[PDB]
Amino acid sequence: AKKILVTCALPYANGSIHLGHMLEHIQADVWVRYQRMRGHEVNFICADDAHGTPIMLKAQQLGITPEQMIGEMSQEHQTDFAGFNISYDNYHSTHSEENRQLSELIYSRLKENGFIKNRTISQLYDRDSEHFFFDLPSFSEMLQAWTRSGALQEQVANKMQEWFESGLQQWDISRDAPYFGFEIPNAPGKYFYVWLDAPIGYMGSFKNLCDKRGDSVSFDEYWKKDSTAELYHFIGKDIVYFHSLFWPAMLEGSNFRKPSNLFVHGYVTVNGAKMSKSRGTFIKASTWLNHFDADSLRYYYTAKLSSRIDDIDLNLEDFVQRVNADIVNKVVNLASRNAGFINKRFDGVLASELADPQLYKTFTDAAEVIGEAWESREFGKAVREIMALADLANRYVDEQAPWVVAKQEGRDADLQAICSMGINLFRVLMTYLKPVLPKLTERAEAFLNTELTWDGIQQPLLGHKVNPFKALYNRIDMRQVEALVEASKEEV
Ligand SMILES: CSCC[C@H](N)COP(=O)(O)OC[C@H]1O[C@@H](N2C=NC3=C(N)NC=NC32)[C@H](O)[C@@H]1O
Incomplete structure (x- = not known):
């Protein structure tokens, strides 16, 4: 009876969930449901990624405050996931008090541990400014040992090489106001770059779950450096850098455990090509449900999924044939x-x-x-x-x-x-x-x-x-x- 914490990447709060997002959540849910069937203690967590300039400006447009837009998007996203029966134990938000406190906690531990650096730069302004950087290069060797400890996917264990061929660099984790995010402590007018607090949102979401359960021990049992609990992140190949380099490093430097593994999947194509709005193949999760049930897509994706990062094709013609032949006819x-x-x-x-x-x-x-x-x-x-x-x-x-x-x-x-x-x-x-x-x-x-x-x-x-x-x-x-x-x- 293992203790497992599984997550799906946190969807940006600036768009509707589509079939591409669903491949990820469905793959994770099937694995999660299997683990529960085998008797393990499983915690399936997610949340909306609600920060960033883009969101701040989109809110201004629609004449709605970001707080209002992300609130509506959060409800829409959860309604769709519930419609596909994605069994999360908790769906939170990166814009929460739990994430604010944890982001500050990690940043303070990093800074105190000497992994945060300062600097100045020039940039287009509607100009200089001080910025804070994370000293990623200091965790290389540790990342190496972790990377090669027979764990990550082969295609992922590799890929990172092309990144090493460019050497690890310090990462700019600060942004200037006006910005929709968390303010950096002891640094007026400075905010944490969304990508810094986003993964911390995994931790914020679990803390929220523990707090709601009145559970004062589980958080530490799962995130302390010597944890015997397993941590897994289901993600797409477009965000592997953040999860395999920055993320593990941030945790290491703040006295927290690193992920047990990263499960990376490929992109969903429809009829062999990237989704196309003009062709009607850019399909929203809500729209799918108006026409088909959730089980049909869950089955189809599962029949094609594997442990590799290969793209998954939703061939519409094949879809009808497969569902009727396997589910109904067999x-x-x-x-x-x-x-x-x-x-x-x-x-x-x-x-x-x-x-x-x-x-x-x-x-x-x-x-x-x-x-x-x-x-x-x-x-x-x-x-x-x-x-x-x-x-x-x-x-x-x-x-x-x-x-x-x-x-x-x-x-x-x-x-x-x-x-x-x-x-x-x-x-x-x-x-x-x-x-x-x-x-x-x-x-x-x-x-x-x-x-x-x-x-x-x-x-x-x-x-x-x-x-x-x-x-x-x-x-x-x-x-x-x-x-x-x-x-x-x-x-x-
Ligand atoms: C701490 S994780 C933060 C993640 C960030 N907000 C990205 O949000 P988003 O762009 O919504 O992507 C969420 C997940 O959906 C996956 N996909 C997005 N479009 C996809 C497809 N077309 N096909 C398969 N997966 C897709 C991404 O790879 C990613 O892991």
Whole structure:
């Protein structure tokens, strides 16, 4: 039972959440849900990145104060994430008292530890000015040892080299008023650059969670230098520099633990290209939900995700085909083709023994490889394994052919045994997919009259009453895709 703290990058409070953002949150949520299923203590945290000149000026435009804009954006963002069932334990803000205090705490520890430097510069002004710099170069060797301690992704362990080929430099962490952010203590008119306080927002968000829980020990247990808890950050490749260099260094110099690992993913493309507004492929999370459910996109992204930083393509044509073929035709089909005979002919009661014990064992035997696949973030591998098992289950059902055994008077016991077998195979499959399809899983659990646990598959449902269900998952069609695209064009 490990203690794990997982985060997703903090979305900027200056735009709506789109399908690109959703790849990140969905990848993280699936991993998080899997970890909870295995019994670990998990804390999934996020928050809006609310500081920076851009935001300050955007607020001025709309005639709304930044405080007002970020407040509205925060609600919009959380409504969308909740719509995709992203299970955060806390969603906070970089513009909070918790983050203000932690930013000052870290800065003061850095300055006192001698990692903060001063200087002057020239810049366009609507001119000189003093600035504060973080002495990154002093943590190089430490970063080296940390970087090579068999942890980060190969493509990431490398990449940084191209950055070393340019040498680490002191980082300008201060900005002048007017600026929407935190004021630097003992330095009037100076503010912390957004990127300095942003990652501290991870800490601010957890502190908020602990404070709300009345938990006065967890914060330190997770962030103290000798913590045995694991810290993971899910991020895109465009912000790896901040998370692999500045961030670890800031923590090291302020007597805090560094991330256990960074899980970097690639960009989402639609129909093979970057999202395009004119083509209606720049899709908002809110818009997606007007047309499709969350499970469909969660499934599609998961079937294509891996432990690498490669781009993920949402091919709209392929989307409809994949969802109907896998979810409806393979998994859900296993339940619907068998539940009828059970509910109608046997009052919903499943057989008292497994018809084919060998087949069931083949299914539960796969838990190890599938669980390891979720754990290692090889989602595509996990899905292929699960769908391969599903093919086996549908083959079993065909060989046994219940639709024929049913019309043969005197074969009741045989029918119940066959159809119950299929229902139990379905139980196992939905357990492996539980991290991926939250809503379909709830519908399956209501039908099975059972909550699905990872260890529970070792005990099949016997002499057990199932409930009649009304379509667990309906097929989708290209006309809905066309409508989604058309709507997205019309929005911009
Ligand atoms: C302390 S972390 C601070 C992060 C900063 N506010 C960036 O915010 P934002 O630009 O909203 O990006 C949030 C995450 O969304 C990811 N993505 C943004 N557009 C994306 C795609 N098109 N595809 C995949 N991920 C995307 C980014 O890589 C990033 O990790």
